[PDB]
Amino acid sequence: FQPGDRIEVLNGEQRGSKGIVTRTTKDIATIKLNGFTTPLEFPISTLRKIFEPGDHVTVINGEHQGDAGLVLMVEQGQVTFMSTQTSREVTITANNLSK
Numbered sequence: 413f414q415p416g417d418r419i420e421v422l423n424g425e426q427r428g429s430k431g432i433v434t435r436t437t438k439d440i441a442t443i444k445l446n447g448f449t450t451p452l453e454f455p456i457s458t459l460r461k462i463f464e465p466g467d468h469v470t471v472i473n474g475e476h477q478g479d480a481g482l483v484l485m486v487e488q489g490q491v492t493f494m495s496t497q498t499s500r501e502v503t504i505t506a507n508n509l510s511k
Contacts, residue, residue: 418430
């Protein structure tokens, strides 16, 4: 994750909360959650990126690494984009993508 990334929390007391990364080490991301007045720290595995249709992404990790395109739909961490390499829809889990 990078500062500025929008994420959601997947587990623990803040599960379902959404916010923005302000700070990250390799193992701990500090997030300013929507509504909360100061930032909180989370282990990286508890977080997931939030994309939206109209975002543009590249695949950073897995079998489709290097594929890229315009995001068309997003459903619970499954992100579908229009591939610039094949002009077909490809769906990839959110944490394997980067804006």
